[PDB]
Amino acid sequence: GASPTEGSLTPFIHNAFKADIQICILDGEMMAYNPNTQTFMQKGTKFDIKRMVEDSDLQTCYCVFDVLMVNNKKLGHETLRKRYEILSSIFTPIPGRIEIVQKTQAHTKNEVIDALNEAIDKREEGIMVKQPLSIYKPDKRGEGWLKIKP
DNA sequence: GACTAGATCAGAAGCAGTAGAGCATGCATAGTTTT
């Protein structure tokens, strides 16, 4: 949906943005949410989030992890911490339709292994790590973002 | 996931052939009238 009147995810989150924010760019991941369990349907069997069938009870959820512009302010060159803080003041999350990915501060390896073990326990792919001072470099790989899997 | 292509079956329309009905033409004969 390109307008609040008609869409599959936008008609519900039109009014989820604080009044001050008028121009806003966000980056995130789109996934499928099962409400009867209140759990995210892991990608794979029984559904594709690209061409979901209307009759299905599953719905679309947007998990945000970055902001690149708010009220004609260019946040590309700022540090990750600042972008996170500004992101916290964009929308009031409304579970099931738009959310912010939680990030935990960690400064030891035991924490990383604990997180990976817990992720495997919750049947997730893995865990990723972000450098607090990393800048957004479009199209580049392995600059401030790292991923870890079993 | 959305979309299309090819195979399959049935339904319906067109055409062929037959049977049944109706309408002209003749004439065969008898009946009636005239001389």
Closest nucleotide to A47's CA, by C1' atom?
B1
> What's chain A's Rg over C-alpha atoms?
17
Residue type for A23, please? I
Per residue, the 3-state secondary structure of A48-89, as one string, reads CCCCCCCCCCCEEEEEEEEEEEECCCECCCCCHHHHHHHHHC
Is strand B in 7 Å reach of the CB of A68? no
* Cα A15 to Cα A21: distance, rounded to the nearest angstrom: 11
Solving technique: cryo-EM
Residue type for A62, please? Y
Is strand B in 7 Å reach of the CB of A44? no
* Cα A127 to Cα A149: distance, rounded to the nearest angstrom: 7
Residue type for A46, please? K
**Span CA (A139) to C1' (B31), Å:** 125
Residue type for A114, please? D
Per residue, the 3-state secondary structure of A99-143, as one string, reads EECCCCCCCCHHHHHHHHHHHHHCCCCCEEEECCCCCCCCCCCCC
Q: How far is CA A140 from the centre of its chain?
A: 19
Query: CA-CA-CA-CA torsion for A18, A21, A22, A25, nearest 10 degrees?
Result: -110
Hunting for tokens 């009759």 — which residue is that? Answer: A55
* Specified resolution (Å): 3.3
Q: Which of A134, A128, A69, A68 is nearest to A103 (CA)?
A: A128
CB-count burial class (<10 Å; 0-12, 13-18, 19+) for A107: exposed
Is strand B in 7 Å reach of the CB of A52? yes
* Cα A48 to Cα A57: distance, rounded to the nearest angstrom: 13
Q: Which of A148, A74, A70, A144 is nearest to A112 (CA)?
A: A148
A59-70 and A98-100: which strand pairing?
parallel
Is strand B in 7 Å reach of the CB of A48? yes
The answer to whether A67 and A87 have CB atoms below 8 angstroms apart is yes
List the structure tokens of A97.
Answer: 């339709």
